Design a protein around this ligand. Structure first.
Ligand SMILES: CCCCCCCCCCCCCCCCCC(=O)OC[C@H](COP(=O)([O-])OCC(O)COP(=O)([O-])OC[C@@H](COC(=O)CCCCCCCCCCCCCCCCC)OC(=O)CCCCCCCCCCCCCCCCC)OC(=O)CCCCCCCCCCCCCCCCC
Ligand SMILES: CCCCCCCCCCCCCCCCCC(=O)OC[C@H](COP(=O)(O)OCCN)OC(=O)CCCCCCCCCCCCCCCCC
Ligand SMILES: NC(=O)C1=CN([C@@H]2O[C@H](COP(=O)(O)OP(=O)(O)OC[C@H]3O[C@@H](n4cnc5c(N)ncnc54)[C@H](OP(=O)(O)O)[C@@H]3O)[C@@H](O)[C@H]2O)C=CC1
Ligand code: SF4
Ligand code: SF4
Ligand code: SF4
Ligand SMILES: [Zn+2]
Lengths: 57, 387, 114, 208, 155, 314, 56, 176, 95, 144
């Protein structure tokens, strides 16, 4: 095969626009909605983004 | 040098959907054709991931719009299969009935529009009158004209209005006469025949490698059917017989579509004779909503209503591939369910997406004026191909 | 760390192939700008081409480089032919993108945390 | 369990288990995991090498045929060291059966030219490239299917939001259709429909 | 007084020009079938003088039916863009009239306004052939009040 | 909300931006482009239109939704113009034909209409009113329309003092009436101008530079109460223009010395007035845009076209 | 059909026998509308004392 | 079972090929068969005059989105958000502030008839049957503005016809 | 006969009235501002107070299968009128 | 021999329906000229005609006449001219006309059912409901 062993960090420019620089990404495990009691919402890490402004059309 | 590059055209007067096309040719002969598909692509499969099963279902209605109750049957069978449910018998029977009715639709369309494209302005008119009668049925059934679902997982809902099967019977009575009128309108016409005789033939094994499934395999050797081999519902029971052809000639495929219309009349008939009066939806309150009388006045019916709409029933995780016989050939959806309400990843299979990839070889031997008939002959909808 | 490299083992042949690609573009800029009847001077168009190369110049992994080259020969493979109308070839240029202020107190002055 | 439930057959279950087991015996090189869905659809997992050998086999061997390729697809799963599952789904013509072949890759590692067995794989592979970006080694052709020519970013993969990063419009300035960063009139309201309590006890995973 | 001649001739070129108005059928998607049922015998178009013929140069007005994807859009505006100068656009179907059942994802353009200006929006999915027909008739009744020439008389 | 106070998001296509305004005319050319920028940056627009319902549809696609709202009016009576500008951040005026038609004369078209709309502009309590006229508007004779319209700026400044009264030079663009006219005057008899030759210095300016001038003038403070003009940045051509624009693009109801003396009017007038950058926007030389608008010929060879480069005495 | 003489002989003489169900479907057999109001059955379960949701 | 066509023996024997030279040569099948089966012309065409006549429909037909109210109208809508929750096009909007009486109604209840696919789901989900798809299809607005409905326009739509909708619902509620 | 703004706008059963400053009001120039002329609340006080000689009663809200779902409301406290949560039409126990 | 019956059908319908000028009237009004069929419960200006049931699909038909809503005139005929109940019974929805089975006659229903508001100064314009948002602060009018 000639696997061609290579060592560098993987990065991707084949993906969208300049949002990559500005926005920070958030990692967490969402805490249970308190007004219910049960954990099945939990147990799975998630990724959501810094929110941004919204206006009245 | 020589050759050329020509392009598509925006519509024939009946045009369902638009493709571009690039055909490198020789003098009035096409050496290489390379259809550009993806022109109309609405991105359904990305949308379905964001909407619950009950919500995403109209997508499975209108991805292939011509044949509709069939696609409904495909997705519904998928969710039932993966969800471990059986619909009550009467649901299965109704589903079969409108399945073969819909097949009558998509076949009569394919044939007639195949005529109008080629010439022959009139048969489009004669038969699409009757098609209007068909939608006159749907409007009673589902309460709308075309895209109205009337199919769910765990069986259909809102059974027929009282007095519908009479009308069904009455249409099915003389449809035979009218389709035979089409058979005198064509079939021994020196024009239509002598235009399509040997154009775009196919070798059986070749069709297998190219993955054609439909009237293709029917009309060219290689006797096969999903209806017969893998019965997916009570559609097993009723008796009928599929046609074939030995010339692989694209004329055989036509006549096979016809005879499938006639056989569809048989299946419709026997279905009208066999209809059990059981019920519509399954009885499991958590899969399908209760009727309003039980909804009101009873607590658990109300809860399962409210949640079954807001959140929707949860489907256990699993990967399924279901396949049915749809008038364009084998149609199927591959469902991928995280244990959840929503689906996750579901790729439909468009028979047109396969058959279309075959124009490269099929059209290799005939000039473009009959590349028209080569495209139109295999039933195809560029709304279904793209997805 | 194993891998299945694509067209090149090391960044050398990568640099080779991207040199090839840029040759192709610098060939066919005039033929296209004349072909779709664009209003841009060939010099300008070429400058935008070399710009689009320079935007990605910081990449290292020759898998990534080679894949980007596949992107390039793909898009160029579409522009060499007529498959792409005047629209998109213009769409590389941004005329109708309003100029975005990149200076702070102008950004703060309007955008409220862009 | 008699009404309202699909009756399940153990005949097809035992048969398909026997057949998958057989495949595992004859192809120890590429075979990883051979499982049977409890609704009876055999599904085989394959290392991302033997796709060509495994499928050359499954088209021949005369104790299995699978002359017809049903559909080729993929599923984008983050969380995995390899994002994607290339899913080969085959149709046995002679025996009335279907089995699935799952293989995997990351973004950079290609999968090599399934065309040489099944012609039907021709467009499915291209569509995968355009809509995902799994590269296919020495495919006879690679182009864009289902997306715009100048379009970019491989939409179906979850990194790509529902809407795009661009829109189209027209204005008398340039006399051409243009593009602007996506702006929605309505936010696309988001819903959390996932309820707690683990409706399904069986599929649970051990907590750690 | 010639303004009587003005208004009368207005009702002449207008009367005819609206009485025929044979358009072109763009027909992207499943609205196209319903349109063909407007061309079927039952709901038939011809009674009203509308003729079925396909070419953007012969086209009196245009019916945008079906879902309009990004990829198709430019071609659409070209088809609009070689046309008899007096022209009208009828948006058929929930899709083209503002995005319909998609309105989201990417490839689909949201409305056909974003491409070409539009006159008669007929909702429905598909709009019942009767409804589409009512849309064309209402377009005729927009043609009645054009009063286009007497403002060329500038009074 | 006080006056449209809070723009939102990245400008354009449902971004509220800053303004409401209104545009008189706008049924053709300069107003069309100007609205294309106003809606292009997302602001609401009000375009009052002549009795023609149809021809304004071309302006529809540029307003998103709930914007570019239409209403009837005529310049004769107050109450219509009164009703249009009632709610506006600003209002701007683009008006008048290059020829006289029947009821209307070169007088009152640049005279009475600005009198009215400016009067009810002040009475409406709206700021940042923009008014335009042709460059080199002079009390002195040899052009009817021009002395008239000069009186126009007179009264427009007399009443409602604070406003931007701005004279572009001959404006140049796609559908315009100037350079296209020169391209179409080549027909039989071959006597457009150059009767006595020379004597004509002129500096056409391309349109998008003008309209960007207006939009910066409208959204930038300290553009009020300051009159100034636009300039073709470099060219400043002699009649060599005619043979140039006639040379490039090669080769295939109006009015009298009103029109030919109009186009034969010669001056760049007075240097000290904020020219362009004083409003902070770039300028465009003639060449490229001239190619764009001209088109025609046989289209098959780009060639060179040999730029005129008059720049006499520049 | 409508009253037809000698033209229905033309049609009997061209395309063969006809007149059963004129193509236009316009003659009676319209079912009226719901002479009875519908009342629907209810299938298995929907019964006390037989069942617990676990089994079914 | 397989019943196949076009696999047949064309007879090269005499009296078949007679009618084959007659057939190719004299166009009898073409002429007789086709020209006559079009001379089938005389059957009364099926066409309906739409202003003055209208095609058939069904009590379950789906028109435009009228809100309903009780006898002694209460604004039958409770605000419970379901119709918005199941909307497959997501196009609905509900914001509900408890009003003077303490009962809850909606402040802004909106629809985009553009986005609306005319499912029928919002007709099934409403517990009290507040919103029902109208019988009337009455449409063709001149602006993209006019196809967006306030709570107000939906009310006035409900007032314009109810005993209509009351007849439909009273007919079909046994099916649902 | 709805309460009318100083501008002439008709306020609604949820008062939406625009302010004289708001530019958006211009969208009503030449075209009607539509509001249902019949308010809801005004029809609640229209209804009589129903009385029942029993302790605890039901409301179907207009009959079976058409109306809101059943709920039994408690009339025990007679210093106020027990109201249905769906209809809004009061009940009391007679004395 | 048979044709005399045909010319008696045409002669009959033109004779009894509309009289001398009535045939031209109804003819240019609606190019469909039908035998006078029953009465059809006139209600508003528009008159209804229900055929003897001779044939489907074109069962029943209407003339809209003039003056509806004190607006427009004849020649403007279109849909929505029918009131709601005649919309129901004219579309085959129900086989029972509105006078034989009456509507519920509720108090809050419109008594007009006016035309179709598209175009004209009377037109629906959508707009935001609810009430402002954040209630901006104000300075005191008293200095210091
Ligand atoms: C204008 C008003 C039209 C109208 O309302 O007519 C309805 C009215 C009767 O309609 P109806 O109540 O439905 O009854 C007729 C049947 O429904 C339907 O009538 P039918 O089609 O059953 O009867 C046909 C009959 C009726 O035909 C005629 O009356 C026309 C010939 C005689 C004219 C005198 O034809 C003949 O008598 C001659 C048949 C010739 C066969 C070969 C034709 C070859 C050339 C084709 C071109 O029509 C007439 O009474 C006919 C009057 C006009 C005849 C033509 C006059 C001008 C020449
Ligand atoms: C006793 C003394 C001696 C007497 C000698 C007398 C000898 C008489 C022998 C017969 C005389 C000739 C009869 C007519 C021949 C006309 C030409 C012909 O035969 O054309 C047939 C030809 C066959 O088509 P195809 O099979 O594709 O070609 C074979 C090529 N290898 O082409 C076709 O079939 C296709 C043509 C289709 C044309 C379009 C459809 C036309 C429909 C209307 C036709 C009828 C019009 C009638 C006239 C109207 C009023 C004037
Ligand atoms: N070469 C040039 O044209 C130059 C022009 N300018 C200035 O720029 C202004 C705008 O130019 P441009 O875009 O070409 O203007 P246009 O003439 O093309 O457009 C003005 C619009 O307003 C309408 N209009 C306004 N008031 C009246 C009226 N009283 N009678 C009739 N029609 C009226 C016009 O006709 P209708 O009513 O039919 O809509 C037309 O639709 C000019 O007025 C001039 O002051 C400056 C330098 C050069
Ligand atoms: S509006 Fe509905 S019927 Fe029309 S194209 Fe869109 S999905 Fe198809
Ligand atoms: S019918 Fe319309 S409003 Fe109702 S759920 Fe469907 S898209 Fe939403
Ligand atoms: S489902 Fe019915 S009651 Fe609930 S919010 Fe919607 S319309 Fe109102
Ligand atoms: Zn109640």
């Amino acid at each position: 095969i000639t696997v061609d062993e290579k060592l560098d960090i993987t990065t991707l420019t084949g993906v969208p626009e300049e949002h990559i620089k500005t926005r920070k990404a958030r990692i967490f495990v969402p805490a249970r909605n308190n007004m219910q009691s049960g954990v099945n919402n939990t147990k799975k890490w998630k990724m959501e983004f810094d929110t941004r402004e919204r206006w009245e059309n | 040098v020589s050759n050329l590059t020509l392009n598509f055209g925006p519509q024939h007067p009946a045009a369902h959907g638009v493709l571009r096309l690039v055909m490198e040719l020789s003098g009035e002969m096409v050496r290489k054709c390379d259809p550009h598909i993806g022109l109309l692509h609405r991105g359904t499969e990305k949308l379905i991931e964001y909407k619950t099963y009950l919500q995403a279902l109209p997508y499975f209605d209108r991805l292939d719009y011509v044949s509709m109750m069939c696609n409904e049957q495909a997705y519904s069978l998928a969710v039932e299969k993966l969800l471990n449910i059986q619909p009550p018998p009467r649901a299965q029977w109704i589903r079969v009935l409108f399945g073969e009715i819909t097949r009558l639709l998509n076949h009569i369309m394919a044939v007639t529009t195949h005529a109008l494209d080629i010439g022959a302005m009139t048969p489009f008119f004669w038969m699409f009158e009757e098609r209007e009668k068909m939608f006159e049925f749907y409007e009673r059934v589902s309460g709308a004209r075309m895209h109205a679902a009337y199919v769910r997982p765990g069986g259909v809902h809102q059974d027929l209005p009282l007095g519908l099967m009479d009308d069904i019977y009455e249409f099915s009575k003389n449809f035979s006469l009218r389709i035979d009128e089409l058979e005198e309108m064509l079939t021994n016409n020196r024009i239509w025949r002598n235009r399509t005789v040997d154009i775009g033939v196919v070798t059986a094994e070749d069709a297998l490698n190219y993955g054609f499934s439909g009237v293709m395999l029917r009309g060219s050797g290689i006797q096969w059917d999903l209806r017969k081999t893998q019965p997916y519902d009570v559609y097993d029971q009723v008796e009928f017989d599929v046609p074939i052809g030995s010339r692989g000639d694209c004329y055989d495929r036509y006549l096979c579509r016809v005879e499938e219309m006639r056989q569809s009349i048989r299946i419709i008939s026997q279905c009208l004779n066999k209809m059990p009066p059981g019920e519509i939806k399954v009885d499991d309150a958590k899969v399908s909503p209760p009727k309003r009388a039980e909804m009101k006045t009873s607590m658990e019916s109300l809860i399962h209503h409210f949640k079954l709409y807001t959140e929707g029933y949860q489907v256990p995780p699993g990967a399924t591939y279901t396949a049915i016989e749809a008038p364009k050939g084998e149609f199927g959806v591959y469902l991928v369910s995280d244990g959840s309400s929503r689906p996750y990843r579901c790729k439909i299979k468009a028979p047109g997406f396969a058959h279309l990839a075959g124009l490269d070889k099929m059209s290799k031997g005939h000039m473009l004026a009959d590349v028209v008939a080569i495209i139109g002959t295999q039933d195809i909808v560029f709304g279904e191909v793209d997805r | 760390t194993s891998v299945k490299p694509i067209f090149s083992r090391d960044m050398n042949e990568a640099k080779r192939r991207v040199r090839e690609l840029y040759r192709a573009w610098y060939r066919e800029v005039p033929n296209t700008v004349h072909l779709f009847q664009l209003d841009i001077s060939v010099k300008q168009g070429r400058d935008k081409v070399r710009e689009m190369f320079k935007k990605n110049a910081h990449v290292t992994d020759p898998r990534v480089v080679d894949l980007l080259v596949i992107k390039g020969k793909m898009e160029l493979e579409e522009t060499i032919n007529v498959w792409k109308q005047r629209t998109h070839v213009m769409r590389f240029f941004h005329e109708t993108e309003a100029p975005r202020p990149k200076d702070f107190l102008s950004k703060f002055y309007v955008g409220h945390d862009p | 369990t008699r009404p309202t439930v699909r009756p399940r057959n153990d005949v097809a279950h035992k048969q398909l288990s026997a057949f998958g087991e057989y495949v595992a015996e004859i192809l120890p090189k590429y075979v990883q995991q051979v499982q049977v869905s409890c609704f009876s659809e055999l599904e085989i997992c394959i290392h991302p090498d033997g796709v060509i050998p495994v499928l050359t086999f499954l088209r021949d061997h005369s104790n299995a045929q699978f002359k017809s390729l049903a559909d080729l697809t993929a599923v984008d799963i983050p969380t995995r060291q390899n994002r994607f599952e290339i899913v080969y789904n085959l149709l046995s013509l002679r025996f009335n059966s279907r089995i699935r072949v799952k293989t995997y890759t990351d973004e950079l590692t290609p999968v090599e030219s399934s065309v040489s067995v099944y012609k039907a794989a021709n467009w499915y592979e291209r569509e995968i490239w355009d809509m995902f970006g799994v590269f296919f080694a020495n495919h006879p052709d690679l182009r864009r299917i289902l997306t715009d020519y100048g379009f970019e970013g491989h939409p179906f993969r979850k990194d790509f939001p529902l809407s795009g990063y661009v829109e189209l419009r027209y204005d008398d300035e340039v006399k051409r259709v243009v593009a602007e960063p996506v702006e929605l009139a309505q936010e696309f309201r988001k819903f959390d429909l996932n309820s707690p309590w683990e409706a399904f006890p069986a599929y649970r995973q051990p907590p750690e | 007084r010639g303004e009587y001649v003005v208004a009368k001739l207005d009702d002449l070129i207008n009367w005819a020009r609206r009485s025929s108005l044979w358009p072109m059928t763009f027909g992207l998607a499943c609205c196209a079938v319903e349109m063909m049922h407007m061309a079927a015998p039952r709901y038939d178009m011809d009674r009203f003088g509308v003729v079925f013929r396909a070419s953007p140069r012969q086209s009196d007005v245009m019916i945008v039916a079906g879902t309009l994807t990004n990829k198709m859009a430019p071609a659409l505006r070209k088809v609009y863009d070689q046309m008899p100068e007096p022209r009208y656009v009828v948006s058929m179907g929930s899709c083209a009239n503002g995005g319909g059942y998609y309105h989201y994802s990417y490839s689909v353009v949201r409305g056909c306004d974003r491409i070409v200006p539009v006159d008669i929006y007929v909702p429905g999915c598909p709009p019942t052939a009767e409804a589409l027909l009512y849309g064309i008739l209402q377009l005729q009744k927009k043609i009645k009040r054009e009063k286009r020439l007497r403002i060329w008389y500038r009074r | 909300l006080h006056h449209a106070v809070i723009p939102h998001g990245k400008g354009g296509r449902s971004s509220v931006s800053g303004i409401v305004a209104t545009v008189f005319g706008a049924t053709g050319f300069l107003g069309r482009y100007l609205v294309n920028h106003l809606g292009r940056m997302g602001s609401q627009v009000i375009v009052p239109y002549r009795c023609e319902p149809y021809d304004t549809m071309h302006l529809r696609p540029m307003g998103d939704l709930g914007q570019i709202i239409f209403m009837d009016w005529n310049g004769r009576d107050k109450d219509s113009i009164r009703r249009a500008v009632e709610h506006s951040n600003v209002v701007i005026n683009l008006v008048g034909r290059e020829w006289e038609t029947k009821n209307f004369d070169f007088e009152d078209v640049f005279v009475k209409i600005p009198q009215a709309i400016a009067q009810v502009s002040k009475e409406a309590g709206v700021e940042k009113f923009i008014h335009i006229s042709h460059l080199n508007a002079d009390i002195k004779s040899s052009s009817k329309y021009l002395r008239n319209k000069a009186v126009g700026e007179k009264e427009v400044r007399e009443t409602f003092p604070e406003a931007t009264i701005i004279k572009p030079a001959d404006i140049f663009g796609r559908e315009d009436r100037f350079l296209n006219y020169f391209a179409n005057i080549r027909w039989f008899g071959g006597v457009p101008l150059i009767s006595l030759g020379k004597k004509t210095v002129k500096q056409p300016v391309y349109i998008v530079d003008v309209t960007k001038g207006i939009i910066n003038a409208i959204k930038d403070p300290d553009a009020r109460g300051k009159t100034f003009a636009f300039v073709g940045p470099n060219r400043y051509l002699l009649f060599d223009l005619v043979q140039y624009v006639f040379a490039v693009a090669h080769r295939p109801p109006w009015t009298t010395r009103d029109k030919v003396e109009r186009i034969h009017t010669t001056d760049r007038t007075l240097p000290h007035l904020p020219g362009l950058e004083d409003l902070g926007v770039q300028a465009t030389p003639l060449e490229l845009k001239a190619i764009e608008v001209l088109r025609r010929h046989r289209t098959y060879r780009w060639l060179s076209s040999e730029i005129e480069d008059v720049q006499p005495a520049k | 059909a409508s009253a037809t003489r000698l033209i229905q002989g033309l049609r009997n003489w061209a395309s063969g026998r006809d007149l059963q169900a004129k193509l236009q479907l316009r003659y009676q057999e319209i079912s009226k509308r719901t002479q009875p109001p519908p009342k629907l059955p209810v299938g298995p379960s929907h019964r006390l004392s037989n069942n617990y949701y676990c089994a079914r | 079972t397989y019943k196949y066509v076009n696999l047949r023996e064309p007879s090269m024997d005499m009296k078949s090929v007679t009618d084959r030279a007659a057939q190719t040569l004299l166009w009898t099948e073409l002429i007789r068969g086709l020209g006559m089966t079009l001379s089938y012309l005389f059957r009364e065409p099926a066409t309906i005059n739409y202003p003055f006549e209208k095609g058939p429909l069904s009590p379950r037909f789906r028109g435009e989105h009228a809100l309903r109210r009780y006898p002694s109208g209460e604004e039958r809508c409770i605000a419970c958000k379901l119709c918005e929750a199941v909307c497959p096009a997501q196009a609905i909007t509900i914001e509900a502030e408890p009003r003077a009486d303490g009962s809850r109604r909606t402040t802004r209840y909106d629809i985009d008839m553009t986005k609306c696919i005319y499912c029928g789901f919002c007709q099934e989900a409403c517990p009290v049957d507040a919103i029902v798809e109208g019988p009337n299809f009455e449409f063709s607005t001149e602006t993209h503005e006019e196809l967006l409905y306030n709570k107000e326009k939906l009310l006035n739509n409900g007032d314009k016809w109810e005993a209509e909708i009351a007849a439909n619902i009273q007919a079909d509620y046994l099916y649902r | 006969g709805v309460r009318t703004s100083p501008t002439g706008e008709k306020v609604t059963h949820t008062g939406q009235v625009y302010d004289d400053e708001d530019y958006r009001r211009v969208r009503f120039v030449g075209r009607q501002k539509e509001v249902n002329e019949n308010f809801a609340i005004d029809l609640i006080a229209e209804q009589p107070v129903s009385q029942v000689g029993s302790r605890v009663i039901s409301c179907d809200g207009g009959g079976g299968a058409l109306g809101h779902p059943r709920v039994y409301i408690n009339l025990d406290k007679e210093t106020k009128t027990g109201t249905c949560g769906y209809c809004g039409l009061q009940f009391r126990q007679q004395h | 021999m048979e044709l005399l019956q045909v010319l008696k059908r045409g002669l009959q319908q033109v004779s009894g329906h509309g009289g001398l000028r009535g045939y031209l009237r109804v003819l240019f009004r609606a190019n469909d000229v039908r035998v006078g069929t029953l009465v059809g419960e006139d209600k508003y200006g528009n008159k209804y005609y229900e055929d003897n049931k001779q044939f489907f699909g074109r069962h029943r038909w209407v003339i809209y006449t003039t003056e509806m809503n004190g607006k427009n005139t004849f020649w403007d005929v279109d849909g929505s001219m029918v009131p709601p109940e005649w919309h129901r019974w004219l579309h085959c929805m129900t086989d029972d006309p509105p006078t034989v089975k009456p509507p519920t006659a509720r108090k809050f229903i419109w008594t007009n059912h006016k035309f179709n508001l598209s175009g004209t100064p009377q037109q629906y314009v959508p707009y935001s409901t609810t009430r402002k948002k954040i209630q901006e602060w104000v300075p005191p009018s008293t200095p210091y």
